[PDB]
Design an enzyme around this catalytic site. Sequence first.
Site, PDB file in Angstrom:
ATOM      1  N   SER A   3      -6.785   3.621   2.968  1.00 30.80           N
ATOM      2  CA  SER A   3      -6.098   2.710   2.049  1.00 30.80           C
ATOM      3  C   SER A   3      -7.104   1.871   1.260  1.00 30.80           C
ATOM      4  O   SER A   3      -7.130   0.645   1.375  1.00 30.80           O
ATOM      5  CB  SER A   3      -5.110   1.816   2.810  1.00 30.80           C
ATOM      6  OG  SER A   3      -4.013   1.456   2.000  1.00 30.80           O
ATOM      7  N   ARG A  51       4.440  -2.135  13.178  1.00 28.19           N
ATOM      8  CA  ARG A  51       4.946  -1.409  12.007  1.00 28.19           C
ATOM      9  C   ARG A  51       5.091   0.087  12.307  1.00 28.19           C
ATOM     10  O   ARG A  51       5.898   0.767  11.676  1.00 28.19           O
ATOM     11  CB  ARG A  51       4.088  -1.651  10.751  1.00 28.19           C
ATOM     12  CG  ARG A  51       2.791  -0.855  10.685  1.00 28.19           C
ATOM     13  CD  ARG A  51       1.943  -1.261   9.500  1.00 28.19           C
ATOM     14  NE  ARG A  51       0.552  -0.851   9.672  1.00 28.19           N
ATOM     15  CZ  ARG A  51      -0.422  -1.082   8.792  1.00 28.19           C
ATOM     16  NH1 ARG A  51      -0.171  -1.719   7.644  1.00 28.19           N
ATOM     17  NH2 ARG A  51      -1.653  -0.665   9.054  1.00 28.19           N
ATOM     18  N   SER A 107       0.791  -1.244   0.000  1.00 26.28           N
ATOM     19  CA  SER A 107       0.000   0.000   0.000  1.00 26.28           C
ATOM     20  C   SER A 107       0.822   1.293   0.000  1.00 26.28           C
ATOM     21  O   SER A 107       0.249   2.394   0.007  1.00 26.28           O
ATOM     22  CB  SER A 107      -1.031   0.004   1.144  1.00 26.28           C
ATOM     23  OG  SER A 107      -2.080  -0.926   0.910  1.00 26.28           O
ATOM     24  N   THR A 138       1.245   3.609   5.308  1.00 36.00           N
ATOM     25  CA  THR A 138       1.424   2.215   5.732  1.00 36.00           C
ATOM     26  C   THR A 138       1.254   1.240   4.568  1.00 36.00           C
ATOM     27  O   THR A 138       0.668   1.585   3.537  1.00 36.00           O
ATOM     28  CB  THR A 138       0.390   1.821   6.773  1.00 36.00           C
ATOM     29  OG1 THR A 138      -0.894   2.271   6.342  1.00 36.00           O
ATOM     30  CG2 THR A 138       0.717   2.425   8.135  1.00 36.00           C
ATOM     31  N   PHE A 177       0.856  -3.383   3.889  1.00 39.73           N
ATOM     32  CA  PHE A 177       0.743  -4.748   4.430  1.00 39.73           C
ATOM     33  C   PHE A 177       0.260  -5.758   3.369  1.00 39.73           C
ATOM     34  O   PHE A 177      -0.882  -5.704   2.923  1.00 39.73           O
ATOM     35  CB  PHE A 177      -0.160  -4.759   5.681  1.00 39.73           C
ATOM     36  CG  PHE A 177      -0.507  -6.141   6.187  1.00 39.73           C
ATOM     37  CD1 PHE A 177       0.490  -7.038   6.576  1.00 39.73           C
ATOM     38  CD2 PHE A 177      -1.850  -6.540   6.291  1.00 39.73           C
ATOM     39  CE1 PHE A 177       0.163  -8.307   7.045  1.00 39.73           C
ATOM     40  CE2 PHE A 177      -2.186  -7.813   6.762  1.00 39.73           C
ATOM     41  CZ  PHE A 177      -1.178  -8.697   7.142  1.00 39.73           C
TER      42      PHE A 177
HETATM   43  C1  LIG Z   1      -1.872  -2.253   1.361  1.00 44.06           C
HETATM   44  O1  LIG Z   1      -1.090  -3.198   1.664  1.00 44.06           O
HETATM   45  C2  LIG Z   1      -3.195  -2.767   1.589  1.00 44.06           C
HETATM   46  N1  LIG Z   1      -3.218  -4.217   1.920  1.00 44.06           N
HETATM   47  C3  LIG Z   1      -4.039  -5.132   1.359  1.00 44.06           C
HETATM   48  O2  LIG Z   1      -5.004  -4.828   0.659  1.00 44.06           O
HETATM   49  C4  LIG Z   1      -3.724  -6.605   1.618  1.00 44.06           C
HETATM   50  C5  LIG Z   1      -4.683  -7.251   2.613  1.00 44.06           C
HETATM   51  C6  LIG Z   1      -4.169  -7.898   3.750  1.00 44.06           C
HETATM   52  C7  LIG Z   1      -5.033  -8.495   4.679  1.00 44.06           C
HETATM   53  C8  LIG Z   1      -6.416  -8.452   4.471  1.00 44.06           C
HETATM   54  C9  LIG Z   1      -6.943  -7.813   3.338  1.00 44.06           C
HETATM   55  C10 LIG Z   1      -6.077  -7.216   2.409  1.00 44.06           C
HETATM   56  C11 LIG Z   1      -3.925  -1.953   2.692  1.00 44.06           C
HETATM   57  N2  LIG Z   1      -3.148  -1.832   3.912  1.00 44.06           N
HETATM   58  C12 LIG Z   1      -3.665  -2.527   5.075  1.00 44.06           C
HETATM   59  C13 LIG Z   1      -3.383  -1.809   6.371  1.00 44.06           C
HETATM   60  O3  LIG Z   1      -3.032  -0.605   6.323  1.00 44.06           O
HETATM   61  O4  LIG Z   1      -3.509  -2.448   7.448  1.00 44.06           O
HETATM   62  C14 LIG Z   1      -5.163  -2.747   4.862  1.00 44.06           C
HETATM   63  C15 LIG Z   1      -5.582  -4.114   5.403  1.00 44.06           C
HETATM   64  C16 LIG Z   1      -5.990  -1.634   5.517  1.00 44.06           C
HETATM   65  S1  LIG Z   1      -5.470  -2.713   3.111  1.00 44.06           S
END
Ligand SMILES: *C(=O)[C@@H](NC(=O)Cc1ccccc1)[C@@H]1N[C@@H](C(=O)O)C(C)(C)S1
Lengths: 234, 247
Positions: free
Chosen positions: B97, B232, B49, B188, B190
Amino acid sequence: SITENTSWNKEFSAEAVNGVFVLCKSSSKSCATNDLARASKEYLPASTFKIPNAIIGLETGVIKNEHQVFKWDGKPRAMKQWERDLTLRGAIQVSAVPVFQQIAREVGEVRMQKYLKKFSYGNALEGQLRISAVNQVEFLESLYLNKLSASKENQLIVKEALVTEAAPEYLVHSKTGFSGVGTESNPGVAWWVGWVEKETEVYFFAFNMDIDNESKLPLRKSIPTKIMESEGII
Amino acid sequence: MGSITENTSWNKEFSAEAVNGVFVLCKSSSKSCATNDLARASKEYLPASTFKIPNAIIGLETGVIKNEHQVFKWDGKPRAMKQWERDLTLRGAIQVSAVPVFQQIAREVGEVRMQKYLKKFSYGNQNISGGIDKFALEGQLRISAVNQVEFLESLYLNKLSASKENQLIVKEALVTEAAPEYLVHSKTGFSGVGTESNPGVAWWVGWVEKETEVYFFAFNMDIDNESKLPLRKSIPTKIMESEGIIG
Ligand SMILES: *C(=O)[C@@H](NC(=O)Cc1ccccc1)[C@@H]1N[C@@H](C(=O)O)C(C)(C)S1
Ligand SMILES: *C(=O)[C@@H](NC(=O)Cc1ccccc1)[C@@H]1N[C@@H](C(=O)O)C(C)(C)S1
């Protein structure tokens, strides 16, 4: 269109304060206030003049860009926080008067005069120029929409410089002002102006009050905040 | 940037929380950095993200995103996260996000335009495999902690291959904390839990404007469990508190 709301007069009465709050949703074409008469009455802008000043400083190229550093000359100043090198945001946030005095000196009285007319700003922290709370709100709207007679780029620079509180679902641009302690018969003025972005919505606000006792100063923030929170804005 | 040095006293915060990761901190005036692990500082991971940053800049530079006042309308249909089920502004979509919004943005930009810009931005290993809405999250694009600070510094100085105007818009949209003495821009990331024996990644990237100084930073860690996610942010904050930057 400005409309009167008596439901918050309990705060002004309880605090023995003479002031006005103006709050608008979406567009300054429909606003609310506690005192219609005062909403349009004109007071010295004090340090809220730093906003138009900054835009004009950049427009004229007196301030070279967003990354400009105003060197402290090493001479004693009125407050300690001003005795250091400052960025544009730094100087706006600690409200360093000599930095902005110097900017306006270079701009020149005639050039400043013109841009102010151009911005429809108003009628120094004590001069001959005065502005109303309705006027402030109309000006801040134009800034937000990029509508001032200035490049979009420069308005963005000042917009970021005015950020005072940030959260994941709302953002606050604002500036305080204060002319000094006065007499019961010759009172000073205190300002807090700005706008809030929340959801896909935008709220413009402007507050002023008379001040003849220095300890009543925090009320320039607590009173507008009590209101804006009650409306669900912050 | 200019120079880098290994500072192993930061590993304390890492060992404490059983975290396998890296932190890179750079001081703008002197063009110099410090990190706890020189090797991981150079290793490339999925951007996740944090790709919303270049994605947002390109989104604007090509007309797809009209301006800073555009609203991204929700269709009333359920989305992967509750947080995402509303109309969002540019800052809104970035702060929560909102993946589907930026995927649509990516779709409209196109394969060839998205490539051309990541080239000019020097963004990572430059690859967009799997699909035009898959590469950042779980595809074939990778970037290092060192690369992130170089990219972010260019953006701060308005030096990327886009209009100053557009670079300013994204810069405001990235503000996350504001005090009288400092201002923080950040994002951020993930990827997911991956598996045991093959974990996913979590990022925190940004910069801190404080006095006349500016401080760029990037953090990433191996992650297999969702309960570790708060780390994080809590580790980089700890390191930056003891250095007298924020808080
Ligand atoms: C950027 O990495 C986004 N991640 C995802 O869409 C992957 C994901 C992981 C677990 C469940 C669903 C989707 C955004 N970043 C995170 C965060 O900031 O915690 C989100 C889960 C909000 S989406
Ligand atoms: C704008 O009003 C500025 N005020 C003055 O210079 C007059 C003054 C009054 C009392 C003490 C010192 C100076 C600056 N802005 C205000 C404010 O934002 O509240 C300050 C009191 C910081 S000085």
